[PDB]
Amino acid sequence: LKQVEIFTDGSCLGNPGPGGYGAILRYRGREKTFSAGYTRTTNNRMALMAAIVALEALKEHCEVILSTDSQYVRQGITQWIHNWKARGWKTADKKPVKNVDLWQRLDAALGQHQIKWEWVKGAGHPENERCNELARAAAMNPTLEDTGYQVE
Numbered sequence: 001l002k003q004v005e006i007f008t009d010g011s012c013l014g015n016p017g018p019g020g021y022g023a024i025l026r027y028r029g030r031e032k033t034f035s036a037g038y039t040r041t042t043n044n045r046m047a048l049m050a051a052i053v054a055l056e057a058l059k060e061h062c063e064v065i066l067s068t069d070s071q072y073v074r075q076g077i078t079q080w081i082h083n084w085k086a087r088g089w090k091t092a093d094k095k096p097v098k099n100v101d102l103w104q105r106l107d108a109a110l111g112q113h114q115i116k117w118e119w120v121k122g123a124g125h126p127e128n129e130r131c132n133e134l135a136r137a138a139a140m141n142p143t144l145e146d147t148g149y150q151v152e
Contacts, residue, residue, distance in 0.1 A: 012046055016041060
């Protein structure tokens with residue numbers, strides 16, 4: 001029943017390089033912000049983190065409208081994540097899946113709520129733009145290591 005709105009964005013100075021994520025959780029006008037910067041990561045991983053952090057902050061089952069502009073997240077959600085799960089998370093050749101640590105973590109957070117995904121594109125909402133600013137700000141002041149990132 002509880003309805004919330006989530007906005008997310010990932011940002012990276014390189015590929016790989018210093019990056020950050022920015023997310024906003026809005027409930028009844030009220031707002032909650034999330035951001036963190038990593039010394040060496042990818043925009044894809046940051047895009048996943050933004051959604052993961054905002055979703056895991058929820059303390060009850062909620063109806064969520066999650067807005068993101070990541071094409072990487074879109075494909076996983078609407079296409080890959082399904083096949084992966086039903087195959088112990090394997091690729092075309094029974095191999096491990098890239099960023100499984102985040103995809104599994106995100107997959108879990110999704111099963112916790114009824115998510116309605118809005119795949120935008122700066123639908124450039126002011127919120128997504130603000131998340132980008134939070135992400136970029138974090139990328140410019142990294143404080144953590146992205147241990148889950150497999151170089152290259």
